[PDB]
A = this chain, B = another copy of it.
Amino acid sequence: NSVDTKEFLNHQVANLNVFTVKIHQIGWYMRGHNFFTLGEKMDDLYSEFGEQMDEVAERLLAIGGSPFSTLKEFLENASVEEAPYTKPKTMDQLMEDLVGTLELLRDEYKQGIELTDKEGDDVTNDMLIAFKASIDKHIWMFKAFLGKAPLE
């Protein structure tokens, strides 16, 4: 019963690429009073997660892995879900999706943290922790924006 650090990292490269595009979807299609605040917030998320992705891929490379490097691979491997923007969505619906995705990444990183601890891959371990630190901070902030406690 095992997925390895390589497979976990590679899965996150896929995930992050899907998330990156989803962040653009949110930024592009957002409407409402928080358009500017959230627009700039999506710009920040985009950089951060793009940087996370780059770091995850570079870490994978550093451990002898081969990162997915096509949209086809990303789609075939991501657990992060994407949907085309057909029906109009509220800022809250968009933010819920964003939060939902952050939660998925947090939980998966949590699995990656445990795995990486079990395999003795200390570097990947700290890297994932550093990222979860930020994911958790965003979960609190975006849930706060949605009028909810970070766990609900």
| Chain A residues at the B interface, C-beta cutoff of 8 Å | 17-18, 21-22, 24-25, 28-39, 41, 50, 54, 57-59, 61-64, 66-75, 82-85, 91, 110, 113-114, 117, 120, 122-123, 125-130, 132-133, 136-137, 139-141, 144-151
Contact = CB atoms under 8 A, between A and B. Distances in A.
A84 B24 CA distance: 24
Given A110-B122, A122-B129, 18 more contacts: A17-B21, A18-B71, A25-B69, A31-B145, A31-B147, A32-B33, A33-B34, A36-B37, A39-B141, A58-B140, A59-B137, A61-B150, A62-B150, A68-B84, A70-B82, A113-B122, A123-B132, A126-B130
A contacts with B: majority SS: helix
Contacts of A35: 141, 144-145
